[PDB]
Design an enzyme around this catalytic site. Structure first.
Site, mmCIF file in Angstrom:
data_model
loop_
_atom_site.group_PDB
_atom_site.id
_atom_site.type_symbol
_atom_site.label_atom_id
_atom_site.label_comp_id
_atom_site.label_asym_id
_atom_site.label_seq_id
_atom_site.Cartn_x
_atom_site.Cartn_y
_atom_site.Cartn_z
ATOM 1 N N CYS B 155 -42.440 -22.805 -58.516
ATOM 2 C CA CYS B 155 -41.192 -23.225 -57.857
ATOM 3 C C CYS B 155 -40.428 -22.129 -57.097
ATOM 4 O O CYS B 155 -39.736 -22.433 -56.119
ATOM 5 C CB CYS B 155 -40.280 -23.962 -58.844
ATOM 6 S SG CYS B 155 -41.103 -25.444 -59.481
ATOM 7 N N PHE B 206 -41.809 -35.255 -58.651
ATOM 8 C CA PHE B 206 -42.450 -34.365 -57.683
ATOM 9 C C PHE B 206 -42.911 -35.134 -56.444
ATOM 10 O O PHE B 206 -43.504 -36.208 -56.551
ATOM 11 C CB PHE B 206 -43.664 -33.659 -58.302
ATOM 12 C CG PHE B 206 -43.340 -32.661 -59.402
ATOM 13 C CD1 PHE B 206 -42.121 -32.662 -60.063
ATOM 14 C CD2 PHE B 206 -44.318 -31.768 -59.821
ATOM 15 C CE1 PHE B 206 -41.857 -31.755 -61.093
ATOM 16 C CE2 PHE B 206 -44.065 -30.858 -60.853
ATOM 17 C CZ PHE B 206 -42.828 -30.854 -61.478
ATOM 18 N N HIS B 297 -33.082 -24.571 -55.658
ATOM 19 C CA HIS B 297 -34.153 -25.484 -56.051
ATOM 20 C C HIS B 297 -33.644 -26.417 -57.156
ATOM 21 O O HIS B 297 -33.286 -25.947 -58.229
ATOM 22 C CB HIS B 297 -35.364 -24.684 -56.540
ATOM 23 C CG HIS B 297 -36.494 -25.535 -57.011
ATOM 24 N ND1 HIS B 297 -37.432 -26.061 -56.152
ATOM 25 C CD2 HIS B 297 -36.831 -25.966 -58.251
ATOM 26 C CE1 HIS B 297 -38.306 -26.774 -56.842
ATOM 27 N NE2 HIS B 297 -37.963 -26.731 -58.116
ATOM 28 N N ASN B 330 -38.711 -33.053 -55.933
ATOM 29 C CA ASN B 330 -39.172 -31.682 -56.031
ATOM 30 C C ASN B 330 -40.453 -31.445 -55.232
ATOM 31 O O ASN B 330 -41.453 -32.092 -55.493
ATOM 32 C CB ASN B 330 -39.484 -31.395 -57.488
ATOM 33 C CG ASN B 330 -38.606 -30.358 -58.070
ATOM 34 O OD1 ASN B 330 -37.364 -30.502 -58.108
ATOM 35 N ND2 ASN B 330 -39.234 -29.288 -58.571
#
Lengths: 367, 372
Positions: B155, B206, B297, B330
């Site tokens: 990440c 995701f 993030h 994500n």
């Protein structure tokens, strides 16, 4: 606001340390080891071919992390069709940081400063695929500061060492007092498998590749205790057109696999001079320079000699490393630099890899 | 041996996603049908809850029902299928990356031939030559572009790549660095497990995307700098490597998504920022951490809530980061660059800001940014 404080001078190699697994195997012993451990001793014609293959490569010994007992515990490794990447990666996750730490400790001992004075860490290896990776693992192994600035370069192949050092030049030069630890490591257990029944490319790997790690401390503006070995004047990279099919590698379910094409030596021979002139041109008789070149094989070295009209002694350090350790992917070229320093003011440190790509640095040697 | 004079600056941002858009409302049905799992009524309930309550509203996915039909082994949790996933990614990632890169270049306003360095990061590849090499003919980069290929950095990968970009851009006069982060979730795709729900999290949270950034110091008359990168730093939360990790396996990209992740971020984020930037964060202000803008993030709504609670942030501060989570999910390393872009279209605004990402380690990568 203004820029942070930057370095004055060029980034320099301040120390080099290297490491290998303890299991040493000579070229003469390799056929017996490989054929026994893969249950192939009944393949007489093939063993004889391998014997002759091994004699013409310019390798005299190599160090291997894998042993008979390791392979007995992992029979899937010798089976060319069995999935086994998980088991290879599990061994690599532990073994690479251990080997890298050994090389880095020797670089730090040579450097003469504490591990806590390292500000940047660049790690490159084909033999890993983890987050957190080898870079993270080295933190407690070496006692690095938790705020060390890490770069983890997984799977960059043979040019990986030069690629990592190109990065270190800029990291070292862009912050005053920056001290970069660069580590490249390679474990051939990632490729290890049973004999092929085509043109013998697993056998080529078996005859040519070895394990090692090399660590380099890179910094500009050396202080009183520090001893610069080579300044990195320029770092460059370029591509040989229409040659991506000749050399490549990728992870598979079964192992790290790829293509080691017969074209490679010729492509290097045909293009190396033009690559160097495209990369460095204005900044530079090829015999007026010193050389630390990723050996590849005896034939690749011969190709480089011929293309550049090099004298016999010029690639001697590079040939020695090939002879003493085999090809260790990204680390090999740093072993070559270390050998050169044990043995001209300007010089070239370069490595060819998949692309085909050349990564090279122009080096200036402390007088 | 000619260096740049001033700070590296973000000069353009370009993003791209696969065309197949999928809303969180249709995901439970789609996923449980295609994995032959419709009999798992209670498991699907957990999945619905994950999809509805964790801050994501839609995502873009490269894989489709068609692709999944052609690759049934993907669905089998025990079947080796890394080769097939990597084969798809070898082709798809450079194409998606190329789309993002071209948008960045068009915004930038100079030809691709002017790019001097290329830094690429993805979990979704394991090839040499890699995505970076593949982008050369796709973008028309000069063969002598100085390339860095960062496979599998998790990440924090986008921030880590930009940290490199700052030094590359600042240490050579005229240097122009193209940075690209891309992510394809077919790397993780698999059927559900009734005992444990890590797969349900991945399937719920995701998505796919690529983001591209042009970094350069000493802007031309034609360039329009968006942010200067004052400082780029990194640090570690001690004793937390078990909470969050990932690795290649024979079956798929796999890892751990620990219960303790949001809490660890909440407990350590302030200390990490203060360790990383120190005196650079001196001065005031009037609102403490609210003096700054934020591109972080996202992870989940709980993770964003943890950052909020740790830094005493007002509701609007993480709105750009939460919007990205909402609209894209994500996308690993690319996500925080989407956040920076959202922040940029959102805009007296704060002058100084933090762009940061947490990943396995646990590590934080962060940049202090000055908006100009």
């Amino acid at each position: 606001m203004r820029r942070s404080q930057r370095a004055d001078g060029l980034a320099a190699v301040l120390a080099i340390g290297t490491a290998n697994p303890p299991n040493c195997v000579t070229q003469e012993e390799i056929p017996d080891f490989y054929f026994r451990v893969t249950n192939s001793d009944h393949l007489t014609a093939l063993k004889d071919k391998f014997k002759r293959i091994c004699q013409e490569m310019g390798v005299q010994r190599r160090y291997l992390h894998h042993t008979e007992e390791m392979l007995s515990a992992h029979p899937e490794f010798v089976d060319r069709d069995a999935p086994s990447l998980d088991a290879r990666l599990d061994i690599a996750a532990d073994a690479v940081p251990e080997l890298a730490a050994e090389a880095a400790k020797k670089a730090i001992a040579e450097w003469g400063r504490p591990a806590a004075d390292i500000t940047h860490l660049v790690v490159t290896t084909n033999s890993g695929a983890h987050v957190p990776g080898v870079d993270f693992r080295l933190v407690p192994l070496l006692g690095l500061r938790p705020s060390v600035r890490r770069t983890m370069l997984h799977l960059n192949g043979c040019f990986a060492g030069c690629a990592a050092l190109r990065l270190a030049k800029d990291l070292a030069e862009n912050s005053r007092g920056a001290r970069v630890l660069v580590v490249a490591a390679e474990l051939t257990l990632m490729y290890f498998t049973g004999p092929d029944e085509g043109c013998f490319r697993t056998l080529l790997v078996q005859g040519l590749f070895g394990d090692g790690a090399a660590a380099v401390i890179v910094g500009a503006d050396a202080d009183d205790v520090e001893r610069p070995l080579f300044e990195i004047v320029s770092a460059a990279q370029t591509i040989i057109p229409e040659s991506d099919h000749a050399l490549n590698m990728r992870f598979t379910e079964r192992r790290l696999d790829g293509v080691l094409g017969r074209q490679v030596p010729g492509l290097i021979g045909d293009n190396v001079e033009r690559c160097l002139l495209d990369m460095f041109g204005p900044l530079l008789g090829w015999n007026d320079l010193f050389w630390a070149v990723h050996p590849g094989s005896s034939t690749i070295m011969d190709q480089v000699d011929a293309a550049l009209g090099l004298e016999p002694g010029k690639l001697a350090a590079s040939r020695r490393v090939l002879s003493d350790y085999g090809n260790m992917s990204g680390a090999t070229v740093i072993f070559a630099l270390d050998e050169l320093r044990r043995q001209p003011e300007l010089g070239v440190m370069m490595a060819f890899g998949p692309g085909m790509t050349v990564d090279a640095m122009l080096l200036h040697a402390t007088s």
